[PDB]
Design an enzyme around this catalytic site. Sequence first.
Site, PDB file in Angstrom:
ATOM      1  N   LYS A 167       7.913  25.685   7.578  1.00 13.76           N
ATOM      2  CA  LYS A 167       6.498  25.585   7.952  1.00 13.76           C
ATOM      3  C   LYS A 167       5.848  24.447   7.191  1.00 13.76           C
ATOM      4  O   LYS A 167       5.989  24.358   5.979  1.00 13.76           O
ATOM      5  CB  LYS A 167       5.725  26.893   7.695  1.00 13.76           C
ATOM      6  CG  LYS A 167       4.413  26.967   8.469  1.00 13.76           C
ATOM      7  CD  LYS A 167       4.621  27.235   9.954  1.00 13.76           C
ATOM      8  CE  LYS A 167       4.193  28.554  10.463  1.00 13.76           C
ATOM      9  NZ  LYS A 167       4.773  28.777  11.809  1.00 13.76           N
ATOM     10  N   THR A 227       9.614  30.696  10.734  1.00 15.41           N
ATOM     11  CA  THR A 227       8.602  29.865  10.049  1.00 15.41           C
ATOM     12  C   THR A 227       7.301  30.637   9.807  1.00 15.41           C
ATOM     13  O   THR A 227       6.647  30.447   8.771  1.00 15.41           O
ATOM     14  CB  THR A 227       8.379  28.500  10.737  1.00 15.41           C
ATOM     15  OG1 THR A 227       7.632  28.651  11.952  1.00 15.41           O
ATOM     16  CG2 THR A 227       9.694  27.782  10.994  1.00 15.41           C
ATOM     17  N   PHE A 258      -2.097 -15.212  -9.383  1.00 11.52           N
ATOM     18  CA  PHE A 258      -0.826 -15.281  -8.677  1.00 11.52           C
ATOM     19  C   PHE A 258      -0.463 -16.743  -8.410  1.00 11.52           C
ATOM     20  O   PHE A 258      -0.991 -17.383  -7.484  1.00 11.52           O
ATOM     21  CB  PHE A 258      -0.810 -14.469  -7.381  1.00 11.52           C
ATOM     22  CG  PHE A 258       0.565 -14.285  -6.800  1.00 11.52           C
ATOM     23  CD1 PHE A 258       1.523 -13.582  -7.508  1.00 11.52           C
ATOM     24  CD2 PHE A 258       0.923 -14.808  -5.576  1.00 11.52           C
ATOM     25  CE1 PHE A 258       2.792 -13.430  -7.006  1.00 11.52           C
ATOM     26  CE2 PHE A 258       2.195 -14.636  -5.050  1.00 11.52           C
ATOM     27  CZ  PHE A 258       3.140 -13.956  -5.781  1.00 11.52           C
ATOM     28  N   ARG A 317      -8.328 -14.096  -8.927  1.00 11.14           N
ATOM     29  CA  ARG A 317      -8.484 -13.390  -7.663  1.00 11.14           C
ATOM     30  C   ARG A 317      -8.902 -11.943  -7.882  1.00 11.14           C
ATOM     31  O   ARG A 317      -8.838 -11.419  -9.004  1.00 11.14           O
ATOM     32  CB  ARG A 317      -7.192 -13.438  -6.837  1.00 11.14           C
ATOM     33  CG  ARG A 317      -6.045 -12.654  -7.446  1.00 11.14           C
ATOM     34  CD  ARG A 317      -4.806 -12.594  -6.590  1.00 11.14           C
ATOM     35  NE  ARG A 317      -3.833 -11.703  -7.212  1.00 11.14           N
ATOM     36  CZ  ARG A 317      -2.649 -11.393  -6.674  1.00 11.14           C
ATOM     37  NH1 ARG A 317      -2.223 -11.908  -5.517  1.00 11.14           N
ATOM     38  NH2 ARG A 317      -1.856 -10.518  -7.307  1.00 11.14           N
ATOM     39  N   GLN A 346       3.740  -6.897  -9.326  1.00  4.90           N
ATOM     40  CA  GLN A 346       5.034  -6.555  -9.897  1.00  4.90           C
ATOM     41  C   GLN A 346       4.951  -6.392 -11.412  1.00  4.90           C
ATOM     42  O   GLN A 346       5.435  -5.410 -11.985  1.00  4.90           O
ATOM     43  CB  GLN A 346       6.057  -7.661  -9.581  1.00  4.90           C
ATOM     44  CG  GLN A 346       6.527  -7.776  -8.121  1.00  4.90           C
ATOM     45  CD  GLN A 346       5.641  -8.572  -7.160  1.00  4.90           C
ATOM     46  OE1 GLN A 346       4.434  -8.746  -7.367  1.00  4.90           O
ATOM     47  NE2 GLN A 346       6.244  -9.012  -6.057  1.00  4.90           N
ATOM     48  N   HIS A 348      -5.814  -7.199   0.466  1.00  2.55           N
ATOM     49  CA  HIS A 348      -6.312  -8.555   0.244  1.00  2.55           C
ATOM     50  C   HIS A 348      -7.806  -8.681   0.512  1.00  2.55           C
ATOM     51  O   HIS A 348      -8.330  -8.116   1.463  1.00  2.55           O
ATOM     52  CB  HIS A 348      -5.565  -9.561   1.107  1.00  2.55           C
ATOM     53  CG  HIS A 348      -4.070  -9.489   0.951  1.00  2.55           C
ATOM     54  ND1 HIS A 348      -3.414  -9.805  -0.219  1.00  2.55           N
ATOM     55  CD2 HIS A 348      -3.108  -9.076   1.816  1.00  2.55           C
ATOM     56  CE1 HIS A 348      -2.116  -9.636  -0.047  1.00  2.55           C
ATOM     57  NE2 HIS A 348      -1.905  -9.176   1.170  1.00  2.55           N
TER      58      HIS A 348
HETATM   59  O1  LIG Z   1       2.248  -9.675  -2.766  1.00  6.52           O
HETATM   60  O2  LIG Z   1       1.106  -9.544  -1.866  1.00  6.52           O
HETATM   61  C1  LIG Z   1       2.470 -11.058  -3.277  1.00  6.52           C
HETATM   62  N1  LIG Z   1       2.818 -11.950  -2.176  1.00  6.52           N
HETATM   63  C2  LIG Z   1       1.653 -12.662  -1.937  1.00  6.52           C
HETATM   64  O3  LIG Z   1       1.444 -13.492  -1.048  1.00  6.52           O
HETATM   65  N2  LIG Z   1       0.637 -12.332  -2.816  1.00  6.52           N
HETATM   66  C3  LIG Z   1      -0.685 -12.959  -2.791  1.00  6.52           C
HETATM   67  C4  LIG Z   1       1.072 -11.457  -3.784  1.00  6.52           C
HETATM   68  N3  LIG Z   1       0.543 -11.139  -4.909  1.00  6.52           N
HETATM   69  C5  LIG Z   1       1.332 -10.483  -5.819  1.00  6.52           C
HETATM   70  O4  LIG Z   1       0.852  -9.958  -6.828  1.00  6.52           O
HETATM   71  N4  LIG Z   1       2.699 -10.394  -5.606  1.00  6.52           N
HETATM   72  C6  LIG Z   1       3.386 -10.729  -4.469  1.00  6.52           C
HETATM   73  O5  LIG Z   1       4.611 -10.723  -4.454  1.00  6.52           O
HETATM   74  O1  LIG Z   2       9.666  27.746  14.224  1.00  9.69           O
HETATM   75  O2  LIG Z   2       8.220  27.635  14.408  1.00  9.69           O
HETATM   76  C1  LIG Z   2      10.204  29.122  14.417  1.00  9.69           C
HETATM   77  N1  LIG Z   2       9.675  30.016  13.391  1.00  9.69           N
HETATM   78  C2  LIG Z   2       8.698  30.745  14.050  1.00  9.69           C
HETATM   79  O3  LIG Z   2       7.928  31.583  13.570  1.00  9.69           O
HETATM   80  N2  LIG Z   2       8.608  30.424  15.392  1.00  9.69           N
HETATM   81  C3  LIG Z   2       7.671  31.070  16.314  1.00  9.69           C
HETATM   82  C4  LIG Z   2       9.591  29.538  15.766  1.00  9.69           C
HETATM   83  N3  LIG Z   2      10.017  29.221  16.934  1.00  9.69           N
HETATM   84  C5  LIG Z   2      11.210  28.549  17.015  1.00  9.69           C
HETATM   85  O4  LIG Z   2      11.585  28.024  18.067  1.00  9.69           O
HETATM   86  N4  LIG Z   2      12.015  28.443  15.891  1.00  9.69           N
HETATM   87  C6  LIG Z   2      11.691  28.774  14.602  1.00  9.69           C
HETATM   88  O5  LIG Z   2      12.540  28.752  13.718  1.00  9.69           O
END
Ligand SMILES: *O([O])[C@@]12[N]C(=O)N([C])C1=NC(=O)[N]C2=O
Ligand SMILES: *O([O])[C@@]12[N]C(=O)N([C])C1=NC(=O)[N]C2=O
Lengths: 301, 301, 301, 301
Positions: free
Chosen positions: B10, B57, B159, B176, B228, B256
Amino acid sequence: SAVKAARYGKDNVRVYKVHKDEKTGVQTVYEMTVCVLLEGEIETSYTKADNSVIVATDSIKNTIYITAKQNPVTPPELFGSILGTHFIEKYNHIHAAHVNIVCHRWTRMDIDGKPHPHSFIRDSEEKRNVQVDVVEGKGIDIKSSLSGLTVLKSTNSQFWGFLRDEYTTLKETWDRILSTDVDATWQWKNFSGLQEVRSHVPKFDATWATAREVTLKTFAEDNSASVQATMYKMAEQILARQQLIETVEYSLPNKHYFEIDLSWHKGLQNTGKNAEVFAPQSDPNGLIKCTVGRSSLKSKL
Amino acid sequence: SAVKAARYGKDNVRVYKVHKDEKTGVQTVYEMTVCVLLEGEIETSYTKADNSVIVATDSIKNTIYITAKQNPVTPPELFGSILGTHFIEKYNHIHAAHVNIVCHRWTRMDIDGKPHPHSFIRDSEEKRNVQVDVVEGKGIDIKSSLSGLTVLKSTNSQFWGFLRDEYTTLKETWDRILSTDVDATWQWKNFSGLQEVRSHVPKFDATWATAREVTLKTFAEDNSASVQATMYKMAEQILARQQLIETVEYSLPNKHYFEIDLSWHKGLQNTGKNAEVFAPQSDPNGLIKCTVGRSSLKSKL
Amino acid sequence: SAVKAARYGKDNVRVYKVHKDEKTGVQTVYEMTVCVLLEGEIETSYTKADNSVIVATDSIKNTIYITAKQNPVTPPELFGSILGTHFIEKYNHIHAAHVNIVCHRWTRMDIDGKPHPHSFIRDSEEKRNVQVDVVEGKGIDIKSSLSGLTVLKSTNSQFWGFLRDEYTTLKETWDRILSTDVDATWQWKNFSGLQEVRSHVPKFDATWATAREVTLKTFAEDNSASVQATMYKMAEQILARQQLIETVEYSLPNKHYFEIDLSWHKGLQNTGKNAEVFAPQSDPNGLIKCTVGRSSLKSKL
Amino acid sequence: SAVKAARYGKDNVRVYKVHKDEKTGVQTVYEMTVCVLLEGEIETSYTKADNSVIVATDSIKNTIYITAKQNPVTPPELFGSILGTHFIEKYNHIHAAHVNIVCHRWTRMDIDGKPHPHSFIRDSEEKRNVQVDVVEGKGIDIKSSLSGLTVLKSTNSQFWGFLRDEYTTLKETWDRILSTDVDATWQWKNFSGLQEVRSHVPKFDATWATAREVTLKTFAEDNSASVQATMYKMAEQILARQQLIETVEYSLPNKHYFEIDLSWHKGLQNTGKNAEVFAPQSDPNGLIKCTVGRSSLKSKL
Ligand SMILES: *O([O])[C@@]12[N]C(=O)N([C])C1=NC(=O)[N]C2=O
Ligand SMILES: *O([O])[C@@]12[N]C(=O)N([C])C1=NC(=O)[N]C2=O
Ligand SMILES: *O([O])[C@@]12[N]C(=O)N([C])C1=NC(=O)[N]C2=O
Ligand SMILES: *O([O])[C@@]12[N]C(=O)N([C])C1=NC(=O)[N]C2=O
C-alpha cells in the site's frame, strides 16, 4: 458578432530583484510572478486582424523587467500600481491594466544565531499577493491577500447544532481537529491615482502583518464553534485595525481528519477521548467563504 | 516465463497522530505519508492466480494504523523499523518489508511570544524521510533524508575554469546567484534487528539536525567554486560528526537565475556589477549528484 | 572522505523538432524532455575545486540541441544512444552517459475525416520513455517504457481467496472496478555500441506498439483474479513477441473505487448487484510490481 | 461589522456512476468532480455561532451521491440543474446553489477493431465542465465549457504589424508555431427552472460537440494573423450555430516555441526557413481573452 469584453497580456513572468547595501554588505532579495493584462480600444485585433492596436505581450514582458529595474518592487501594491499606471499613460488607446503579483518567500537565514547578509530560505510556500486594477478615469483598485498559509489545531474546535434531516449522517462533535489553508483578502478604498497610493505606502506592509497576526492568533485562541464563526472574528478584527480597507474576504477549506475505529482489532480504543491516530482526507473538503464589511444597519440590529 | 522480482503493498497512506499531555495540556502532532511494499514467497499470486499468499494491501493499510496506535511514530527510523519487522515476523512467507515514510512539518505556533499548546503551522514543505528495508536474515537497512529544502544566496557563488570547446557558450563568472532544492541522504550502518535500532534511537533526530545545520551553514558560508565543491564539503562534515553513517548522498538542482541585458532600452545597465533584476528559469536546470564515503586509500592520496 | 559515486548534467531540457516534406506539405512534430548525466574522472571537481574536468551543464544542453539538429530524434532509443555515445567519445575522461527521454504525444488531427498536414493534438498525457546508459567499454543498455496510460474496467475484475487474519477487514469480491495508471518497461539485451543499436532500429517502434496493444487487450479481456495475475499475463506475452528483450517490468497502482451504502436514506440500494454510484479514492492506493524474465528451471517446474 | 456575502459547501467530491445494459452487456461509465456551494439566510452561522442554519457540508456530500443514484448524471448541465434545484426547494432558507462539475474522460476502448463492452481509457486530460447557478426566483444560469484541450500547429501562424516602440524587441514573423490549451465557455440564455432545462436537454451534448469541432477545425485551417483573430472566428461560428447561447468566451495561452540560433557551432543553420529544432518555453506565456456576443449596432458598423 461583436466583442463584448477583451483583455490580453503576459502571464507567468518570473522576476527576481536584489538590493545590495555596499556600505554594510547586506543584500536583500525579492522574487515574484507577475501577470499583466490590458484592456482598451483593441477590438479590431480580434475582428479585423488589426495588429496595430496590440502592444505585444513580449513587449509587456520587457516592460515588467524595465519597471522593476527603475522602481522599488516592494510593497507589491506600489509596484503593481506603478506598472499598471505606465500602460494606461504610455498608450492612449489602452484604458485599463490588470496587474496580478504573487510574492514568493525568501527569508534571511540565521546562521549560528546571526542573520546572514546574503543567504535565504523558502521558509513557507505561503504567498503574499496583490491584484491591482488601474482603470483610466477611475483610479486604482487594490486587493491584497495572503494565501497558502496552512495550519492545524489538535483540539478547541467543535461542530454541533447543525441542521439534521434525512440527508444527515454526520455526528455532532465537541472536540475535533481543525486544519485549513488560509486565503484572506483585504480590499482597499479606491485610490485616485499613483500619488494617493504612494501616500499610503507604509500601510501596505503594516496591514499584511496585521492580517497575518490576527489570522494566526484567532485560529489558535478561538474555541471554535465552526469555520464560519472563527473566520468572521478574524475579518471583524482586521477591519477594526485599518480604516482604509472596505472589506475582508476569507476562503477556507475544512481539511478533514477522520477518526479510525480500531475496536475490531483486539478491542483497540481509538475513538472519542482515546482518539490518537487519524486518517487525513485529501478529498472531499468543506469550503467556507465570506466577505465582511462595516455595518450600516441602524434598526433591527 | 518466470517472476524475477516482485513486491506489492500500500502506497500513499496518510497518517496523523496526536500526543496529549493531560497534566500540562500540551499537545504534539505528527503527520506522515507511508508506503509499505512486501516481498517473499508470493510468485504464485502472479503465475497461478493464488491469492492465498497475498496479505491484502487493505490489510497492510490497517496494520500501518494499528502499529501507529501501539507505538511511537517518532523518530521515523524507529517507526519504520517496527512496522517492517512486524511483517517479516508475523508472516512466515514474507521475507522483506520496504517501508518509506515522508514526514510533514507541523511546527508549534508562537502566539504573543509564547508557544501555543495545540496550534501548528506548516512552516515549510521541506520533508524528513526514511527508507527502511527490513530483510529477513539480513537485518535492517536505513536511509534517512531531508528534501525540499529550498535556498538561495545572492552572491558568493562562482563558476569559472570549466572545460571550453566548440560546444561551449557559457561565460565564466566570479559572482552569481546560487539556488537549489536540497535532497540529502545519510545511510546508516546495517542494523541486526529492531533491538539494535532501538539502542541508537537518540542518534536519529540528532543526525537529522546535524545534517540540516551543516547544509545551511555550509551553503551560507562557502564562497562556492561550484555546486560540486560545496556539496562535497557538506557531506564530509556530516560523516565526521556521526560514525554510524557510512555514506552521505546529495542531489542538487542548479536553479538558474539569468541576467537580463536591458541596454537596448535607454542604455539601462543591468549586467555585471549593475545586475539587479534577473529572470528565474524554470527549466532546464543543472543536476549535480554525489555519494561520499570514508577514504581507504593509503598511497597516491 | 572520498567520492564513491558521482554524476552530473542537465535535466528538464525541453526539445521540439519538426520535419517538413516540401513535396507533399506534410509536417511531422516531435517533442521530448531530456536529461543527460555524465560520469567519469570528475572527482576532483568535488574534492579540489577543479572545474577543468567539468563539461558545463550549459554545454551539455547545447549539445542536446545540436545533436537533435544533426540526427533523427526518433525512435527515442536511437536518439538517446547517439547522444550518449557522443559524450563518451568526445571526452576522453567521461566514461558513462545516462540519457533519459520522455516523449510527449502530438497526434495528427483529423479534420472532416482527413489527416491534417500540420495540426496536432495532445490526445493523452501518456508518455513513451527511454533510459539509455552508455558505458565506455560496456556498450549500451536500454530500458524502454510507456507510462501514464490510465484505464478502467467496470466489471470482470475479482479479488477473493486472499489471506485473512486479525488484521483483515476487506470483503471478498467477485465483481469490482479495476483502474490503474500503467507503467510498463522492457529491457533490451545489451548492445555493443551504436552500430548494433542502429541494426535493430525498426524493432523499437514495433515493440512499443506490441507492449501497448498487449497491455490494452489483456486488461480489457482478462477476467482478472488480481492485479498480480493480470500484469503477469501482459509481461509473458510481450516476452514471447520480442526475443531481444530480456525482462518486462510492470508497476501498477490499484486506484480504488469504493461502494457507497445509501440504505440509511429511504432504503436506497446501491451495493452489490445494485451498485451504481461509487466514490473514487485518491489515496491510499495498492501498488503492485513485478519483473518477469524467461524461465531457466528444468525440474520442479 | 456585517456579512456582505457568504457561501459554503463541499468541494472536490469525486463521483463515478455506471450504467449496465443487462440485455446487451454494454456498460457505460461517468466520472466527475463536483462542488456545491450554498447561499441564503446563513449569516448568523458566521456572526452568532448559530449552526441551526447550516446544512452540513457532509450532508451536501451525501446529497450529491443520493442525487447521482436517483437521476441521470449526463448531460452535466442537467445533473447540475437537478442538484442545485434540490437545495433551494428542500431548504426554505437556502436561496442559491452554485454547482460546478468537472467531467473526466472515460472513452470506450476498441480492441481488435471492436468497441469493448466494459473497458475504457482516459484518452485526454481535456475536461468538459459546467457552472450551474440556481437562484431562487431568478431561474438557472448555466455556463458550459471545454478546457485542457492542448493543440499545436507547426506552420500557418503569423504575427506581424504589432505596435513597435522603445519597449519592443520582438521580431515580426510570417511563419511560427502556435500552441495553446483551449478553455472555451458558452453561456446559455437564462432558464426559468428545471422544466425549461429539461426541454433543451439534447442541445447540451450537441453544442459541446459543435464547440469542440469548430475549435479544432478553425485552429487547423485558419492561417492565423494572431491568437486574437483566430479565437474570434471560433466564437462567431459557435454563436451562429446555437441561438440559445448568448456569449462565447475563450481564454488561450500562447505557449511559446523559440527558435535556437546554432550558427555559433560549425555554422549550423537552424533559424528562419532552416528552423527545425526549437526550445518550448514553460514560462512566461501570452494570455489572450475575449467574450463575444451578438451585435446590436445599426450604424457606424
Ligand atoms: O551545473 O549547472 C554546472 N554546469 C553549468 O553550466 N553551470 C553554470 C554549473 N554550475 C556549477 O556549479 N556546476 C556545474 O557543473
Ligand atoms: O492490491 O490493492 C490488493 N490488496 C487489496 O486489498 N486489494 C483489494 C487488491 N487487489 C488486488 O488485485 N491485489 C492485491 O494484492
Ligand atoms: O464545513 O465542513 C461544515 N460542514 C460539515 O460537515 N462540517 C464538519 C463543517 N464544519 C464546519 O466548521 N462548518 C461547516 O459548515
Ligand atoms: O501574444 O503572445 C502576442 N504578443 C506577442 O508577443 N506575441 C508573439 C503574440 N502573438 C499573438 O498572437 N498575439 C499577441 O498579442
